[PDB]
Design a protein around this ligand. Sequence first.
Ligand SMILES: c1ccc(CN2CCC(n3cccc3)CC2)cc1
Length: 460
Amino acid sequence: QPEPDMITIFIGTWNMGNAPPPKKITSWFLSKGQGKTRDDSADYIPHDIYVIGTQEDPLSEKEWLEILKHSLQEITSVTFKTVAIHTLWNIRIVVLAKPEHENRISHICTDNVKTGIANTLGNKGAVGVSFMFNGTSLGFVNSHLTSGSEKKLRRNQNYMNILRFLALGDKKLSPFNITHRFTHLFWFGDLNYRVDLPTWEAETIIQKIKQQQYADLLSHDQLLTERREQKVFLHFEEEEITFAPTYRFERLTRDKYAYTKQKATGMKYNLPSWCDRVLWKSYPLVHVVCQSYGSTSDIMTSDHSPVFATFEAGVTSQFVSKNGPGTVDSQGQIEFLRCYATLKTKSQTKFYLEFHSSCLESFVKSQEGENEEGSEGELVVKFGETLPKLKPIISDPEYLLDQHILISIKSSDSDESYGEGCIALRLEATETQLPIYTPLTHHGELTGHFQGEIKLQTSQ
Ligand SMILES: c1ccc(CN2CCC(n3cccc3)CC2)cc1
Protein backbone atom coordinates (compact mmCIF):
# COMPACT_ATOMS: atom_id res chain seq x y z
CA GLN A 1 0.00 0.00 0.00
CA PRO A 2 1.68 3.30 -1.11
CA GLU A 3 1.93 6.26 1.34
CA PRO A 4 -0.20 9.21 0.29
CA ASP A 5 1.22 12.54 -1.03
CA MET A 6 -2.22 14.19 -0.53
CA ILE A 7 -5.06 13.90 2.01
CA THR A 8 -8.36 15.64 2.39
CA ILE A 9 -9.32 17.29 5.65
CA PHE A 10 -12.83 18.28 6.76
CA ILE A 11 -13.09 21.22 9.18
CA GLY A 12 -16.39 21.92 10.85
CA THR A 13 -17.34 24.68 13.23
CA TRP A 14 -20.71 24.91 14.92
CA ASN A 15 -21.91 27.02 17.86
CA MET A 16 -24.65 24.68 19.06
CA GLY A 17 -26.37 27.34 21.21
CA ASN A 18 -26.46 24.93 24.22
CA ALA A 19 -29.12 22.78 22.44
CA PRO A 20 -28.82 19.16 21.43
CA PRO A 21 -28.41 18.56 17.72
CA PRO A 22 -31.16 17.20 15.49
CA LYS A 23 -31.23 13.50 14.61
CA LYS A 24 -29.54 14.00 11.20
CA ILE A 25 -26.45 16.22 10.73
CA THR A 26 -25.00 14.44 7.64
CA SER A 27 -25.35 17.58 5.41
CA TRP A 28 -22.57 19.18 7.52
CA PHE A 29 -20.06 16.38 6.81
CA LEU A 30 -21.20 16.28 3.14
CA SER A 31 -20.49 20.04 2.63
CA LYS A 32 -24.10 20.60 1.44
CA GLY A 33 -26.12 23.83 1.80
CA GLN A 34 -25.08 27.36 0.79
CA GLY A 35 -21.67 28.62 -0.43
CA LYS A 36 -18.94 26.56 -2.06
CA THR A 37 -20.40 23.07 -1.75
CA ARG A 38 -19.17 19.56 -2.46
CA ASP A 39 -20.26 17.59 -5.58
CA ASP A 40 -22.89 14.88 -5.01
CA SER A 41 -20.66 12.36 -6.83
CA ALA A 42 -18.15 12.53 -3.85
CA ASP A 43 -20.71 11.86 -1.08
CA TYR A 44 -19.48 8.31 -0.34
CA ILE A 45 -15.77 9.22 -0.52
CA PRO A 46 -14.49 9.69 3.04
CA HIS A 47 -12.20 12.54 3.98
CA ASP A 48 -8.95 11.31 5.53
CA ILE A 49 -9.34 13.44 8.67
CA TYR A 50 -12.48 15.14 10.14
CA VAL A 51 -11.90 17.94 12.68
CA ILE A 52 -15.10 19.09 14.46
CA GLY A 53 -15.11 22.31 16.53
CA THR A 54 -18.13 23.10 18.65
CA GLN A 55 -18.98 26.04 20.88
CA GLU A 56 -21.83 26.21 23.41
CA ASP A 57 -21.77 22.41 23.21
CA PRO A 58 -24.20 20.90 25.79
CA LEU A 59 -23.28 17.24 25.18
CA SER A 60 -20.85 15.00 26.95
CA GLU A 61 -17.75 13.87 24.99
CA LYS A 62 -19.25 10.37 24.82
CA GLU A 63 -22.63 11.63 23.57
CA TRP A 64 -21.07 13.80 20.81
CA LEU A 65 -18.55 11.14 19.72
CA GLU A 66 -21.38 8.61 19.25
CA ILE A 67 -23.32 11.10 17.09
CA LEU A 68 -20.26 11.99 15.01
CA LYS A 69 -19.11 8.42 14.46
CA HIS A 70 -22.68 7.17 13.59
CA SER A 71 -22.99 10.16 11.17
CA LEU A 72 -19.76 9.35 9.29
CA GLN A 73 -20.54 5.58 9.29
CA GLU A 74 -23.92 6.32 7.66
CA ILE A 75 -22.29 8.53 4.95
CA THR A 76 -19.25 6.39 4.15
CA SER A 77 -19.77 2.90 5.72
CA VAL A 78 -16.38 3.51 7.45
CA THR A 79 -15.86 3.26 11.22
CA PHE A 80 -13.62 6.26 12.00
CA LYS A 81 -11.04 6.15 14.78
CA THR A 82 -10.85 8.87 17.44
CA VAL A 83 -7.47 10.65 17.23
CA ALA A 84 -8.18 13.17 19.99
CA ILE A 85 -10.97 14.97 21.87
CA HIS A 86 -10.47 17.99 24.11
CA THR A 87 -13.03 20.22 25.84
CA LEU A 88 -12.66 23.56 27.70
CA TRP A 89 -16.01 24.48 29.29
CA ASN A 90 -18.43 24.19 26.34
CA ILE A 91 -15.72 24.57 23.62
CA ARG A 92 -14.71 21.24 22.10
CA ILE A 93 -12.56 19.75 19.37
CA VAL A 94 -12.86 16.17 18.02
CA VAL A 95 -10.41 14.69 15.49
CA LEU A 96 -11.45 11.50 13.66
CA ALA A 97 -9.41 9.66 11.03
CA LYS A 98 -9.90 6.72 8.62
CA PRO A 99 -8.71 3.48 10.32
CA GLU A 100 -5.96 2.99 7.67
CA HIS A 101 -4.31 6.17 9.11
CA GLU A 102 -3.97 4.93 12.68
CA ASN A 103 -0.27 3.91 12.24
CA ARG A 104 0.45 7.15 10.20
CA ILE A 105 -0.64 9.42 13.09
CA SER A 106 1.67 10.07 16.06
CA HIS A 107 2.81 12.82 18.51
CA ILE A 108 -0.83 13.72 19.39
CA CYS A 109 -1.02 16.89 21.58
CA THR A 110 -4.01 18.75 23.06
CA ASP A 111 -4.18 22.01 24.90
CA ASN A 112 -6.54 24.89 25.77
CA VAL A 113 -6.25 28.62 26.45
CA LYS A 114 -8.68 30.55 28.69
CA THR A 115 -8.97 34.19 27.54
CA GLY A 116 -9.83 37.28 29.64
CA ILE A 117 -9.24 38.23 33.35
CA ALA A 118 -11.80 37.79 36.25
CA ASN A 119 -15.11 39.22 34.73
CA THR A 120 -14.02 38.05 31.21
CA LEU A 121 -12.44 34.69 32.43
CA GLY A 122 -14.90 31.77 32.55
CA ASN A 123 -16.29 30.88 29.16
CA LYS A 124 -14.26 32.11 26.10
CA GLY A 125 -10.99 30.60 24.88
CA ALA A 126 -9.70 27.93 22.55
CA VAL A 127 -8.94 24.22 22.38
CA GLY A 128 -6.44 22.67 19.99
CA VAL A 129 -5.02 19.43 18.69
CA SER A 130 -1.81 18.68 16.86
CA PHE A 131 -0.21 15.54 15.49
CA MET A 132 2.15 14.23 12.83
CA PHE A 133 0.69 12.52 9.77
CA ASN A 134 3.76 10.65 8.39
CA GLY A 135 6.29 13.49 7.74
CA THR A 136 3.71 16.32 7.96
CA SER A 137 2.76 18.26 11.12
CA LEU A 138 -0.90 19.31 11.40
CA GLY A 139 -2.37 21.79 13.94
CA PHE A 140 -6.04 22.61 14.59
CA VAL A 141 -7.46 25.42 16.77
CA ASN A 142 -11.14 25.87 17.69
CA SER A 143 -11.64 29.26 19.37
CA HIS A 144 -14.77 30.95 20.78
CA LEU A 145 -13.76 34.62 20.93
CA THR A 146 -15.38 37.51 22.80
CA SER A 147 -18.95 38.37 21.64
CA GLY A 148 -20.51 41.71 20.76
CA SER A 149 -20.26 44.04 17.80
CA GLU A 150 -18.26 46.72 19.74
CA LYS A 151 -15.58 44.25 20.98
CA LYS A 152 -13.46 43.59 17.84
CA LEU A 153 -10.30 44.79 19.65
CA ARG A 154 -10.99 42.26 22.46
CA ARG A 155 -11.35 39.50 19.83
CA ASN A 156 -7.97 40.55 18.36
CA GLN A 157 -6.44 40.37 21.87
CA ASN A 158 -8.05 36.95 22.38
CA TYR A 159 -6.40 35.79 19.11
CA MET A 160 -2.91 36.92 20.22
CA ASN A 161 -3.34 35.29 23.68
CA ILE A 162 -4.39 32.00 22.05
CA LEU A 163 -1.47 31.87 19.54
CA ARG A 164 1.01 32.87 22.29
CA PHE A 165 -0.12 30.42 24.97
CA LEU A 166 -1.55 27.36 23.18
CA ALA A 167 1.12 24.69 23.65
CA LEU A 168 0.89 22.33 20.66
CA GLY A 169 3.45 20.70 18.37
CA ASP A 170 7.13 20.10 18.93
CA LYS A 171 8.20 21.67 22.25
CA LYS A 172 11.86 21.79 20.90
CA LEU A 173 10.63 24.60 18.57
CA SER A 174 10.94 26.90 21.62
CA PRO A 175 11.12 30.27 19.82
CA PHE A 176 8.07 29.49 17.69
CA ASN A 177 4.36 29.85 18.43
CA ILE A 178 1.66 27.71 16.81
CA THR A 179 1.67 29.98 13.72
CA HIS A 180 5.08 28.46 12.79
CA ARG A 181 4.99 24.93 14.29
CA PHE A 182 2.90 23.12 11.62
CA THR A 183 3.06 22.34 7.91
CA HIS A 184 -0.69 23.10 7.92
CA LEU A 185 -2.51 25.04 10.68
CA PHE A 186 -6.32 25.35 10.60
CA TRP A 187 -7.93 27.93 12.91
CA PHE A 188 -11.71 27.96 13.09
CA GLY A 189 -14.51 28.63 15.51
CA ASP A 190 -17.10 31.19 16.57
CA LEU A 191 -14.67 34.02 16.06
CA ASN A 192 -17.59 36.38 16.72
CA TYR A 193 -16.61 39.16 14.27
CA ARG A 194 -19.68 41.07 13.10
CA VAL A 195 -21.00 43.00 10.12
CA ASP A 196 -20.33 46.59 11.26
CA LEU A 197 -23.29 48.55 9.92
CA PRO A 198 -25.70 50.83 11.78
CA THR A 199 -28.42 49.17 13.88
CA TRP A 200 -31.02 51.17 11.85
CA GLU A 201 -29.89 49.15 8.73
CA ALA A 202 -31.00 45.74 10.13
CA GLU A 203 -33.93 45.30 7.74
CA THR A 204 -31.83 46.51 4.78
CA ILE A 205 -29.19 43.84 5.68
CA ILE A 206 -31.91 41.16 5.83
CA GLN A 207 -33.14 42.29 2.36
CA LYS A 208 -29.64 42.00 0.94
CA ILE A 209 -29.31 38.48 2.39
CA LYS A 210 -32.64 37.39 0.82
CA GLN A 211 -31.30 38.66 -2.55
CA GLN A 212 -28.06 36.72 -1.99
CA GLN A 213 -26.19 40.04 -2.37
CA TYR A 214 -23.38 39.71 0.17
CA ALA A 215 -20.82 42.24 -1.27
CA ASP A 216 -21.94 45.35 0.69
CA LEU A 217 -22.18 43.20 3.84
CA LEU A 218 -18.74 41.48 3.48
CA SER A 219 -17.15 44.91 2.95
CA HIS A 220 -18.20 45.66 6.60
CA ASP A 221 -17.24 42.25 8.04
CA GLN A 222 -14.93 43.02 10.93
CA LEU A 223 -12.71 39.95 10.38
CA LEU A 224 -12.02 40.88 6.73
CA THR A 225 -11.46 44.60 7.60
CA GLU A 226 -9.25 43.81 10.64
CA ARG A 227 -7.26 41.30 8.52
CA ARG A 228 -6.89 43.90 5.69
CA GLU A 229 -5.48 46.38 8.27
CA GLN A 230 -3.09 43.68 9.65
CA LYS A 231 -4.68 43.79 13.09
CA VAL A 232 -5.36 40.03 13.36
CA PHE A 233 -4.72 36.71 11.59
CA LEU A 234 -1.66 37.99 9.76
CA HIS A 235 -0.48 35.42 7.19
CA PHE A 236 -3.68 33.37 7.38
CA GLU A 237 -5.96 32.66 4.40
CA GLU A 238 -9.77 32.39 4.19
CA GLU A 239 -11.78 31.16 1.19
CA GLU A 240 -14.23 33.66 -0.32
CA ILE A 241 -17.53 33.68 1.55
CA THR A 242 -20.51 32.89 -0.72
CA PHE A 243 -23.02 31.76 1.99
CA ALA A 244 -25.43 33.88 4.04
CA PRO A 245 -24.48 35.10 7.52
CA THR A 246 -24.57 32.14 9.93
CA TYR A 247 -25.76 34.16 12.97
CA ARG A 248 -28.21 35.03 14.54
CA PHE A 249 -31.17 32.82 13.50
CA GLU A 250 -34.46 32.08 15.20
CA ARG A 251 -34.27 28.42 16.15
CA LEU A 252 -36.18 25.62 14.27
CA THR A 253 -36.28 27.61 10.97
CA ARG A 254 -33.64 29.46 8.89
CA ASP A 255 -36.29 31.86 7.57
CA LYS A 256 -35.68 34.57 10.22
CA TYR A 257 -32.72 36.48 11.62
CA ALA A 258 -33.23 37.46 15.28
CA TYR A 259 -31.26 40.69 15.59
CA THR A 260 -33.21 43.03 17.91
CA LYS A 261 -31.97 43.84 21.44
CA GLN A 262 -33.48 41.72 24.23
CA LYS A 263 -32.80 41.24 27.97
CA ALA A 264 -31.39 37.81 26.94
CA THR A 265 -28.79 39.60 24.69
CA GLY A 266 -27.82 42.14 27.37
CA MET A 267 -29.75 44.72 25.33
CA LYS A 268 -27.30 44.25 22.39
CA TYR A 269 -28.26 44.04 18.72
CA ASN A 270 -27.02 41.00 16.82
CA LEU A 271 -27.05 42.16 13.22
CA PRO A 272 -26.60 39.23 10.83
CA SER A 273 -22.93 38.26 10.82
CA TRP A 274 -20.39 35.70 9.69
CA CYS A 275 -19.40 34.68 13.21
CA ASP A 276 -18.37 31.14 12.25
CA ARG A 277 -15.19 30.89 10.19
CA VAL A 278 -12.33 28.67 9.00
CA LEU A 279 -8.90 30.05 8.21
CA TRP A 280 -5.58 28.34 7.53
CA LYS A 281 -1.88 28.94 7.27
CA SER A 282 0.45 26.48 5.56
CA TYR A 283 4.21 26.63 5.09
CA PRO A 284 5.35 28.26 1.85
CA LEU A 285 4.94 26.24 -1.38
CA VAL A 286 3.05 23.36 0.26
CA HIS A 287 -0.06 22.25 -1.61
CA VAL A 288 -3.27 23.37 0.18
CA VAL A 289 -6.50 23.95 -1.75
CA CYS A 290 -9.91 24.73 -0.25
CA GLN A 291 -12.48 22.52 -2.00
CA SER A 292 -15.59 23.65 0.00
CA TYR A 293 -16.56 26.50 2.32
CA GLY A 294 -20.21 26.93 3.20
CA SER A 295 -22.99 26.60 5.73
CA THR A 296 -25.74 24.00 6.15
CA SER A 297 -29.36 24.98 5.59
CA ASP A 298 -31.15 22.05 7.30
CA ILE A 299 -29.63 22.01 10.87
CA MET A 300 -31.70 24.49 12.85
CA THR A 301 -31.41 23.62 16.60
CA SER A 302 -28.99 26.51 17.22
CA ASP A 303 -29.09 30.24 16.56
CA HIS A 304 -25.96 29.55 14.41
CA SER A 305 -25.73 27.37 11.33
CA PRO A 306 -22.85 24.91 11.06
CA VAL A 307 -19.99 25.88 8.77
CA PHE A 308 -17.90 23.40 6.79
CA ALA A 309 -14.65 23.71 4.92
CA THR A 310 -12.64 21.02 3.17
CA PHE A 311 -9.09 21.02 1.97
CA GLU A 312 -6.62 19.09 -0.15
CA ALA A 313 -3.37 19.12 1.82
CA GLY A 314 0.04 17.94 0.70
CA VAL A 315 1.74 15.41 2.95
CA THR A 316 5.15 13.75 2.88
CA SER A 317 6.34 10.25 3.82
CA GLN A 318 8.41 9.20 6.89
CA PHE A 319 11.78 9.14 5.03
CA VAL A 320 14.49 6.52 5.87
CA SER A 321 17.85 6.44 4.03
CA LYS A 322 20.94 4.19 4.60
CA ASN A 323 22.29 7.37 6.40
CA GLY A 324 19.65 9.54 8.21
CA PRO A 325 17.83 9.17 10.52
CA GLY A 326 20.67 8.90 13.13
CA THR A 327 23.50 10.49 11.12
CA VAL A 328 24.06 13.23 8.42
CA ASP A 329 24.16 12.57 4.61
CA SER A 330 27.47 14.33 3.71
CA GLN A 331 26.06 14.67 0.11
CA GLY A 332 23.62 17.40 1.44
CA GLN A 333 24.10 21.03 2.54
CA ILE A 334 22.22 24.34 2.91
CA GLU A 335 24.18 27.59 2.57
CA PHE A 336 22.86 31.15 3.23
CA LEU A 337 24.61 34.01 1.33
CA ARG A 338 24.26 37.83 1.64
CA CYS A 339 21.59 37.46 4.41
CA TYR A 340 20.23 40.27 6.54
CA ALA A 341 17.33 40.83 8.90
CA THR A 342 15.50 44.20 8.87
CA LEU A 343 13.90 44.72 12.31
CA LYS A 344 11.32 47.26 13.56
CA THR A 345 12.83 47.16 17.15
CA LYS A 346 14.29 50.33 18.75
CA SER A 347 16.69 48.22 20.94
CA GLN A 348 20.50 48.10 20.21
CA THR A 349 21.48 44.54 21.40
CA LYS A 350 23.45 42.17 19.15
CA PHE A 351 21.35 39.42 17.50
CA TYR A 352 22.01 35.81 16.41
CA LEU A 353 19.90 33.35 14.44
CA GLU A 354 18.59 29.90 15.16
CA PHE A 355 17.75 27.53 12.29
CA HIS A 356 15.20 24.84 13.21
CA SER A 357 14.04 22.02 10.93
CA SER A 358 13.17 18.32 11.18
CA CYS A 359 15.77 17.88 8.33
CA LEU A 360 18.49 18.76 10.98
CA GLU A 361 19.57 16.51 13.91
CA SER A 362 19.17 19.62 16.12
CA PHE A 363 18.76 23.39 15.75
CA VAL A 364 21.76 25.49 14.72
CA LYS A 365 22.86 28.77 16.36
CA SER A 366 24.65 31.35 14.16
CA GLN A 367 27.31 33.87 15.16
CA GLU A 368 26.14 37.39 16.00
CA GLY A 369 25.27 39.62 13.06
CA GLU A 370 26.64 43.11 12.31
CA ASN A 371 24.11 45.90 13.17
CA GLU A 372 23.77 48.92 10.82
CA GLU A 373 21.15 51.75 10.61
CA GLY A 374 18.69 51.61 7.61
CA SER A 375 18.00 54.91 5.71
CA GLU A 376 14.36 55.17 7.06
CA GLY A 377 15.38 54.56 10.77
CA GLU A 378 15.40 50.68 10.82
CA LEU A 379 17.84 48.20 12.40
CA VAL A 380 19.56 46.03 9.72
CA VAL A 381 21.40 43.00 11.06
CA LYS A 382 23.93 41.74 8.45
CA PHE A 383 25.12 38.08 8.53
CA GLY A 384 27.23 38.16 5.34
CA GLU A 385 28.65 34.71 4.43
CA THR A 386 29.22 34.05 8.21
CA LEU A 387 26.10 31.76 8.61
CA PRO A 388 26.86 28.09 9.49
CA LYS A 389 26.51 25.52 6.64
CA LEU A 390 23.45 23.32 7.59
CA LYS A 391 23.90 19.54 7.34
CA PRO A 392 20.63 17.75 6.63
CA ILE A 393 20.10 14.16 7.85
CA ILE A 394 19.02 13.05 4.32
CA SER A 395 20.38 14.46 0.98
CA ASP A 396 17.84 12.83 -1.35
CA PRO A 397 16.20 15.74 -3.26
CA GLU A 398 12.75 14.01 -3.14
CA TYR A 399 13.03 14.51 0.65
CA LEU A 400 15.04 17.75 0.95
CA LEU A 401 13.14 19.94 -1.55
CA ASP A 402 9.95 19.27 0.52
CA GLN A 403 11.51 20.61 3.77
CA HIS A 404 11.38 24.00 5.48
CA ILE A 405 13.79 26.00 7.66
CA LEU A 406 12.29 27.96 10.57
CA ILE A 407 14.36 31.03 11.51
CA SER A 408 14.36 32.92 14.80
CA ILE A 409 16.36 36.10 15.34
CA LYS A 410 17.28 36.32 19.03
CA SER A 411 18.79 39.01 21.27
CA SER A 412 22.31 38.11 22.56
CA ASP A 413 21.44 40.02 25.81
CA SER A 414 18.13 38.22 26.63
CA ASP A 415 18.02 35.14 24.31
CA GLU A 416 14.48 36.24 23.49
CA SER A 417 13.16 35.90 19.88
CA TYR A 418 12.48 39.23 18.16
CA GLY A 419 11.09 37.57 15.05
CA GLU A 420 10.24 34.17 13.52
CA GLY A 421 9.80 33.12 9.91
CA CYS A 422 10.04 30.20 7.55
CA ILE A 423 11.91 29.43 4.32
CA ALA A 424 10.86 26.68 1.84
CA LEU A 425 13.55 24.42 0.29
CA ARG A 426 11.19 23.91 -2.73
CA LEU A 427 13.70 25.77 -4.94
CA GLU A 428 13.72 26.37 -8.70
CA ALA A 429 17.29 24.92 -8.84
CA THR A 430 19.96 23.19 -6.69
CA GLU A 431 23.68 24.20 -6.52
CA THR A 432 22.41 27.71 -7.63
CA GLN A 433 22.26 30.94 -5.52
CA LEU A 434 18.56 31.90 -5.34
CA PRO A 435 16.75 34.69 -3.50
CA ILE A 436 14.98 33.76 -0.25
CA TYR A 437 12.63 35.88 1.87
CA THR A 438 10.34 35.56 4.86
CA PRO A 439 8.51 38.14 6.89
CA LEU A 440 9.37 37.92 10.60
CA THR A 441 6.69 37.98 13.30
CA HIS A 442 6.64 37.83 17.07
CA HIS A 443 3.45 37.03 18.97
CA GLY A 444 1.93 36.86 15.44
CA GLU A 445 2.62 40.56 14.66
CA LEU A 446 5.07 41.79 12.02
CA THR A 447 8.49 42.67 13.52
CA GLY A 448 10.73 42.67 10.43
CA HIS A 449 11.99 40.71 7.43
CA PHE A 450 14.72 38.22 6.58
CA GLN A 451 16.16 38.03 3.06
CA GLY A 452 19.24 36.82 1.25
CA GLU A 453 20.25 33.95 -0.97
CA ILE A 454 20.30 30.19 -0.47
CA LYS A 455 22.43 27.47 -2.19
CA LEU A 456 21.06 23.94 -1.70
CA GLN A 457 23.13 20.78 -2.43
CA THR A 458 21.20 17.46 -2.72
CA SER A 459 22.54 14.00 -3.79
CA GLN A 460 21.38 14.78 -7.41
C1 LIG B 1 1.66 38.08 1.84
C2 LIG B 1 1.31 38.86 0.72
C3 LIG B 1 0.07 38.66 0.08
C4 LIG B 1 -0.82 37.71 0.58
C5 LIG B 1 -2.23 37.47 -0.08
N1 LIG B 1 -3.17 38.09 0.47
C6 LIG B 1 -3.55 37.66 1.79
C7 LIG B 1 -4.86 38.32 2.27
C8 LIG B 1 -4.78 39.77 2.18
N2 LIG B 1 -6.11 40.29 2.62
C9 LIG B 1 -6.57 40.18 3.89
C10 LIG B 1 -7.84 40.76 3.93
C11 LIG B 1 -8.13 41.20 2.68
C12 LIG B 1 -7.05 40.91 1.86
C13 LIG B 1 -4.45 40.16 0.82
C14 LIG B 1 -3.13 39.53 0.37
C15 LIG B 1 -0.46 36.95 1.70
C16 LIG B 1 0.77 37.14 2.34
